[PDB]
């Protein structure tokens, strides 16, 4: 989509792996605020928003906290308390036609600044100080939108760039987007430290003979002693006995 028509989206309720990015592309512009890219896959978030669009070459720097310009001040501006990051990879093999591709536009003229994450589509004809030249030409009768017009002769500064901005939330978050992905082969009949879906303990595991009802996950004997557990992978019931101990 265009700069003034970014594609807002929400991505929640998923085991989110931020390492599918690195096999994609050279990642010309990749810098993260508030969280390191290396330590992303582990952390959890409230709501992850993604905005996708395309801009020119020498304006990729303008998508930053507190930076003023013409694409930042007129049609897309993100706050100073932004947490997240931006990912831009130069793309002029799929966006530039020979002669100028008048398909991508950008509001070039307007009246004032916009509030954070304020997207507008109105395409009225700009004023002329006095009662303007509505739908005609004259002194300063400039349509507000302007096409990019890419061609394969533009310098690297004028080439099209695809860019996605991810806005995270980290304060008090109800983990909805984060991945663990870490399991180990099961060991039986040996004193083993186990962590079954959060239940942590020690003991010897033995094949079970008791019928768990299908909605049950844990088993208890008298006095709340956890006696059995069902595997979250193979759904087998397992018996727990504390390994041998005593006084000498």
């Amino acid at each position, epitope marked *: 989509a265009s700069v003034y028509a970014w594609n807002r989206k929400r991505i929640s309720n998923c085991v989110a792996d931020y390492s599918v990015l690195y096999n994609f592309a050279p990642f010309f512009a990749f810098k993260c605020y508030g969280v390191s890219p290396t330590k992303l896959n582990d952390l959890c978030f409230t709501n992850v928003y993604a905005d996708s669009f395309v801009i020119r070459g020498n304006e990729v720097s303008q998508i930053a906290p507190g930076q003023t310009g013409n694409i930042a001040d007129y049609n897309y501006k993100l706050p100073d308390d932004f947490t997240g990051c931006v990912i831009a990879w130069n793309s002029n*093999k*799929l966006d*530039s*036609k*020979v*002669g100028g591709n008048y*398909n991508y536009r950008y509001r070039l003229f307007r009246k004032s600044n916009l509030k954070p994450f304020e997207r507008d589509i109105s395409t009225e004809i700009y004023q002329a100080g006095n009662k303007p030249c509505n739908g005609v030409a004259g002194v300063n009768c400039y349509f507000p939108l302007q096409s990019y017009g890419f061609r*394969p*002769t*533009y310098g690297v500064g004028h080439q099209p760039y695809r860019v996605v901005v991810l806005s995270f939330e980290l304060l008090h978050a109800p983990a909805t987007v984060c991945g663990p992905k870490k399991s180990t082969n099961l060991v039986k009949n040996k004193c083993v430290n186990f962590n079954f879906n959060g239940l942590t303990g020690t003991g010897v595991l033995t094949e079970s003979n008791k019928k768990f009802l299908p909605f049950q996950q844990f088993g208890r004997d008298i006095a709340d002693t956890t006696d059995a557990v069902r595997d979250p992978q193979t759904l087998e019931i397992l018996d727990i006995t504390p390994c041998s101990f005593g006084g000498v």
Partner: antibody
Amino acid sequence: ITLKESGPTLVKPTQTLTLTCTFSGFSLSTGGVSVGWIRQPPGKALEWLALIYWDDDKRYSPSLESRLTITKDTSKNLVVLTLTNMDPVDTATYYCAHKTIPTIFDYWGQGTLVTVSS
Amino acid sequence: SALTQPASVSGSPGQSITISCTATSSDVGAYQYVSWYQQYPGKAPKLMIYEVSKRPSGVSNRFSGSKSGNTASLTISGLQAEDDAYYYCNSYTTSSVVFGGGTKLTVL
């Protein structure tokens, strides 16, 4: 990727020449991909004719535009070029090559020699 | 007028040679994409190299491009008798794709 040209081999002066280029291996739906036409007089250099992008944005040669209405059909992967008012300058070979943005004309067809005379 | 290519060249078999196709015309843009085509003796030209210092997988390892400013020096090392053919250059200008005046290579 493969291309093959076809059409009338003979045409008379001031006539409407038609050519059909059928390809296989790719389509006109993925981004960046386009298909263009090229001509070559005997013993001379090549020249452009038209281009059909994947989004159905079309381009013609500046000098010889207002002609050669190039159409297409994405179901059977076929392109059609039609240029009327045949002149003896247009007696040349004709190629339909698929164009990408950096690798200009990386897949050419065979090419058919066409004559404009009695 | 748009580009410029030498008439023909004849290099003894097994040496190297570079050819220039200067534009000799202002505002062809950034002059960044420059492709070279192989014209056989009456066949459809085949792409040899594009993006001058780059080269498409599928061709030999003797051709190598360079750019001395406003031209593209297409080089051919270890000339073999198979190399007798025509060569052309191609790069869009502001309004439309343009070609070189052509070059002939006969190996003797």
